[PDB]
Design a binder for this molecule. Structure first.
Ligand SMILES: C[C@@H](Oc1cc(-c2cnn(C3CCNCC3)c2)cnc1N)c1c(Cl)ccc(F)c1Cl
Ligand SMILES: C[C@@H](Oc1cc(-c2cnn(C3CCNCC3)c2)cnc1N)c1c(Cl)ccc(F)c1Cl
Ligand SMILES: [Cl-]
Lengths: 154, 154
C-alpha cells in the first residue's frame, strides 16, 4: 500500500541546505534531498545515496528525525517518507541539471516556495524535535487534512 | 464558530450508564447524557443539570475528562463538547419519554449502536485517560477524518 522514500535535510547551526528542483515532480519548489529506496538497500543507505546523488555532498552519520505519510486523492499508493537530518557533511553543494542547492539562514526559509506540509513539520525539525505526520493532498498545493505529532521514537 | 455542549458518563468500577434516545437527534442510539450549555451557566453546571434532567440522577462531583469538537459537512456551526465523568451518584435512573437509561458491563458496551466516534474515545475514558478529539462527519454514520490524543490537561 505504501512506497518508501527518503528525505534528507542538511541542518547546521545557522543555516539549512535546500535544493530547487529544475524539472519533473516538484519543479520550481525548494526541498530537501531524497528519493525512492531501492531493492536490497536499507532506508538509511538510500537516504545517503540520494543526498550524494542530488546535492554532491558526502554524508557520514544520518539521524532519523521523522516519518511522514502522504496520500494523494485519486492515487492508490501512499508515500512513506523517512526523514533524516545531518549537520556533518563533506564536499560542497553541486548544481546539476536536476537540482540547484542553496543555503538558507534559518529565519529566511522560503516556505511560500516549498511544499505546504513543510510549514508544519520544518519548525519541528529546526528545534530538533522528532515527528510522525500524515498529509492528505488534493493536487500539489492543497492539504485537505493532516495529523502531526512529536515522538520520542521515529 | 462553535456551540458548547456537555456529555456526562456515569462510570462505576464494573459498569457504565448509557441512555437510549427515544426521539429526535440520535434516536435509537445509546449515549451519555448532556446537551446545550445555557446563558449565564458554567459548563460544569450545565453538565450537572443535563445529567439530572435526562437520567434522573443527582451528581455532586463531576470530573473533566475530554473535549471533542464535531464538524458536520454542510453545517457552519461546530459542536464543542465538554466531556465529564462521575462515579458518585444519587438516586436511581429514570426512564422518561425522551430517554431510557440502562447499565452496561464494561465488556458489553454496545458500540455498534452508539455514535461511531465513541469507539475511538470511550476506551480512553474507561482507562481514566483524558483526551482531546476532533471528528469530521458526513451525516450521522460516517467519519471522514479525525484526530485524537491523550492530554494531561483537558
Ligand atoms: C518534493 C518532495 O516533497 C514533497 C512532495 C509532495 C508532493 C505533492 N505531490 N506530490 C506528487 C508530491 C508534497 N510534500 C512534500 N514535502 C517529495 C517528492 Cl517530489 C517525491 C517523493 C517524496 F517523498 C518527497 Cl518528500
Ligand atoms: C448524541 C450525542 O453524541 C454524538 C452526536 C453526534 C452527531 C452526529 N450528528 N449529529 C448532528 C450529532 C456524533 N457523535 C456523538 N457522540 C450528541 C448530540 Cl445528539 C448532540 C450534541 C452533542 F454534543 C452530542 Cl455529544
Ligand atoms: Cl485528520
Amino acid at each position: 500500500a505504501s512506497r518508501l522514500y527518503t528525505l534528507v535535510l542538511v541542518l547546521q547551526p545557522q543555516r539549512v541546505l535546500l535544493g530547487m528542483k529544475k524539472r519533473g515532480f516538484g519543479a520550481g519548489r525548494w526541498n530537501g534531498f531524497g528519493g525512492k529506496v531501492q531493492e536490497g538497500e536499507t532506508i538509511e543507505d538510500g537516504a545517503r545515496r540520494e543526498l550524494q546523488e542530488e546535492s554532491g555532498l558526502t554524508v557520514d552519520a544520518l539521524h532519523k528525525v521523522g516519518q511522514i505519510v502522504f496520500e494523494f486523492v485519486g492515487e492508490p499508493e501512499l508515500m512513506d517518507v523517512h526523514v533524516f537530518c545531518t549537520d556533518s557533511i563533506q564536499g560542497t553543494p553541486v548544481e546539476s541539471d536536476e537540482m540547484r542547492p542553496c543555503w538558507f539562514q534559518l529565519d529566511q526559509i522560503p516556505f511560500k516556495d516549498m511544499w505546504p506540509d513543510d510549514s508544519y513539520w520544518f519548525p519541528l525539525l529546526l528545534q530538533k524535535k522528532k515527528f510522525h505526520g500524515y498529509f492528505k493532498f488534493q493536487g500539489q498545493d492543497t492539504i485537505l487534512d493532516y495529523t502531526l505529532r512529536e515522538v520520542d521514537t521515529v
